[PDB]
Amino acid sequence: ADYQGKNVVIIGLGLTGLSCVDFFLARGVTPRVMDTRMTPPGLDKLPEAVERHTGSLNDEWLMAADLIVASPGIALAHPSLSAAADAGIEIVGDIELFCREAQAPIVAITGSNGKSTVTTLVGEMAKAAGVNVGVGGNIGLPALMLLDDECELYVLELSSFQLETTSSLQAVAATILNVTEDHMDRYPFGLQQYRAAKLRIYENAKVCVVNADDALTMPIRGADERCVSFGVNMGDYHLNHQQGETWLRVKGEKVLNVKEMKLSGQHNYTNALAALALADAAGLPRASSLKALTTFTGLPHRFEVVLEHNGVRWINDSKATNVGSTEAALNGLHVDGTLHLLLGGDGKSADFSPLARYLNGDNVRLYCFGRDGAQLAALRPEVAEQTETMEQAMRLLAPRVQPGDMVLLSPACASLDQFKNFEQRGNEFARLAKELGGH
Numbered sequence: 001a002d003y004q005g006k007n008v009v010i011i012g013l014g015l016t017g018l019s020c021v022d023f024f025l026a027r028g029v030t031p032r033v034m035d036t037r038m039t040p041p042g043l044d045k046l047p048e049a050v051e052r053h054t055g056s057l058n059d060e061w062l063m064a065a066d067l068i069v070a071s072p073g074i075a076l077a078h079p080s081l082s083a084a085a086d087a088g089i090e091i092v093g094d095i096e097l098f099c100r101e102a103q104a105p106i107v108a109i110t111g112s113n114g115k116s117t118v119t120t121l122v123g124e125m126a127k128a129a130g131v132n133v134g135v136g137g138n139i140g141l142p143a144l145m146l147l148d149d150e151c152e153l154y155v156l157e158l159s160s161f162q163l164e165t166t167s168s169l170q171a172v173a174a175t176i177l178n179v180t181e182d183h184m185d186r187y188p189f190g191l192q193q194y195r196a197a198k199l200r201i202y203e204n205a206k207v208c209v210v211n212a213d214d215a216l217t218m219p220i221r222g223a224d225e226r227c228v229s230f231g232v233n234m235g236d237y238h239l240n241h242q243q244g245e246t247w248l249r250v251k252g253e254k255v256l257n258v259k260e261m262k263l264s265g266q267h268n269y270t271n272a273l274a275a276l277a278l279a280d281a282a283g284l285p286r287a288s289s290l291k292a293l294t295t296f297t298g299l300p301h302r303f304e305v306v307l308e309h310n311g312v313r314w315i316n317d318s319k320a321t322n323v324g325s326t327e328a329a330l331n332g333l334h335v336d337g338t339l340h341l342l343l344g345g346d347g348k349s350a351d352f353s354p355l356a357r358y359l360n361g362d363n364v365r366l367y368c369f370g371r372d373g374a375q376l377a378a379l380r381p382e383v384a385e386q387t388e389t390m391e392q393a394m395r396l397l398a399p400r401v402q403p404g405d406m407v408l409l410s411p412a413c414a415s416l417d418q419f420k421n422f423e424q425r426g427n428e429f430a431r432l433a434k435e436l437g438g439h
């Protein structure tokens with residue numbers, strides 16, 4: 001597209017907004033930028049010629065714009081943006097700008113949880129094929145930074161927020177991995193509204209990869225000829241268990257024993273299936289995509305086995321900051337002895353009820369900590385202990401573990417009551433797992 005001579009205003013001075021600034025500067029357009037934070041991090045990366053306004057939005061800048069480029073972190077519903085749209089001012093986001101310029105096929109991945117794992121996995125499948133693939137859309141590598149005429153394939157992780165401002169995406173393959181109660185703040189009309197944002201990803205997609213086990217991932221008008229499904233018990237791509245073994249199965253044919261993979265957990269096996277369905281639909285060779293499933297290490301803090309010693313697996317699932325993540329970790333969970341389950345932190349007023357139906361059984365112990373520990377111990381008081389901190393809980397369980405056991409940090413809560421971020425929490429869990437379980 002051609003932006004010469006336009007009055008362009010960018011909202012957000014994070015990495016995403018900075019990538020938008022770079023995009024317009026590379027095209028000879030000097031945009032204006034604003035951020036409601038007084039001193040956003042990106043401020044001191046800006047060139048001198050870019051006018052900037054911080055500490056709030058600048059309504060007259062917005063109302064004079066030819067094009068508003070909104071960070072995903074501000075709502076289309078914010079009064080200033082509603083006022084601009086009422087005036088007929090075009091509002092887009094960075095993904096919309098990307099889609100207008102992308103000259104290679106796009107694989108597009110959204111969902112409440114698992115996006116980063118599936119996105120990275122599809123990227124590995126492309127790399128195994130020798131494809132110069134560009135992988136991004138997370139806050140840490142914004143899509144506009146991927147744009148390059150040498151790129152042969154784009155793999156984008158897309159949030160519901162980015163999708164709300166995107167209209168030009170024509171994915172060669174797209175998925176909604178799952179939809180669970182999250183981002184409730186931004187979706188005042190509930191789960192079907194949050195869903196409608198994610199459903200935009202299928203607009204003009206050539207192939208829709210849907211979750212057979214989550215009907216909210218189906219396209220808005222229902223299943224159609226574009227749809228390929230992945231699931232646990234059935235679907236085009238599904239899981240097969242027998243003789244104590246598990247296989248990935250595609251259209252009636254086993255394709256891989258999961259013992260060749262390095263990921264653990266049924267939900268990561270379904271992530272593998274979704275990734276393979278997307279890669280297949282994108283035209284990547286099956287052989288190299290299966291090879292990627294055997295080399296993919298997984299991402300830190302996502303159901304990550306950090307220690308396996310003396311028959312005890314220690315699993316860092318610190319990135320399970322919400323209930324749907326932990327529920328997925330407990331569903332179909334394979335443990336031969338006792339599960340020692342670490343829950344706690346700032347639960348953000350979540351309903352933890354869903355976790356209850358997994359915590360019966362003679363082989364479960366709960367260790368609950370942080371701000372909301374008491375709520376979590378309430379799930380099943382008989383098998384629960386409550387401490388202030390994760391380290392205290394780990395010291396409580398470490399002398400009790402036996403071969404066959406699993407120690408799972410799947411907190412279902414944010415970490416900010418006691419840690420700088422979930423990465424520090426996961427890193428601390430790994431340090432203590434090795435201190436207490438390695439020797």
Ligand SMILES: Nc1ncnc2c1ncn2[C@@H]1O[C@H](COP(=O)(O)OP(=O)(O)OP(=O)(O)O)[C@@H](O)[C@H]1O
Nearest residue numbers: 112113114115116117267302303319320324325328
């Ligand atoms: N298919 C899945 N369903 C539910 N939870 C999952 C699934 N795959 C992974 N998880 C868990 O969800 C948490 C987040 O994983 P991941 O970082 O891949 O998600 P995401 O969608 O990228 O998240 P974000 O919205 O923060 O970008 C981790 O606990 C991971 O184990």
Ligand SMILES: [Ca+2]
Nearest residue numbers: 011012035036
């Ligand atoms: Ca802002």
Ligand SMILES: [Ca+2]
Nearest residue numbers: 373386387388
């Ligand atoms: Ca206590």
Ligand SMILES: [Ca+2]
Nearest residue numbers: 414415421422
């Ligand atoms: Ca956190």
Ligand SMILES: [Mg+2]
Nearest residue numbers: 051052053058
């Ligand atoms: Mg001024």
Ligand SMILES: [Mg+2]
Nearest residue numbers: 112159182183
């Ligand atoms: Mg999210």
Ligand SMILES: [Mg+2]
Nearest residue numbers: 115116138157
């Ligand atoms: Mg992510």
Ligand SMILES: [Mg+2]
Nearest residue numbers: 212213214215
């Ligand atoms: Mg079902």
